[PDB]
């Protein structure tokens, strides 16, 4: 169960710029 | 009571 | 972003008998 | 049940 | 080598 | 089980410049 | 290239 | 960044039998 759950994430975001 | 998810801001599975 | 995972969870799975 | 997450602020697995 | 997801065996999402 | 939890994070965040 | 998760055997989040 | 992880978990698994 999740409750109040803010900003939830899960392996890897990121950003590329070359 | 009953496994869920409640007042979830933003979710992101893998990126 | 994920290689090679084995059994990948995020949260609370559990049972109830009562 | 009885294990949950409940008031979790900002949540980060890997990165 | 890129962003995605690979050999991921069995995946559960809040439950 | 988790309570109460102020900015969760495991494994490493960080950013690139050069 | 940046951030990932390589050969992870068994990821359990909260519980 | 994860490299060669073995059994990573995070907050608390236990069982119960009561």
């Given at each position: 169960?999740?409750?109040n759950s803010t900003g939830?994430?899960?392996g890897a975001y990121n950003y590329?710029?070359? | 009571?009953?496994?869920n998810?409640?007042?979830c801001?933003?979710?992101q599975?893998?990126?």
């Open positions: 169960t999740i409750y939830i994430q899960i590329m710029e070359i | 009571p009953l496994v998810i409640y007042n801001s933003g979710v599975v893998g990126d």
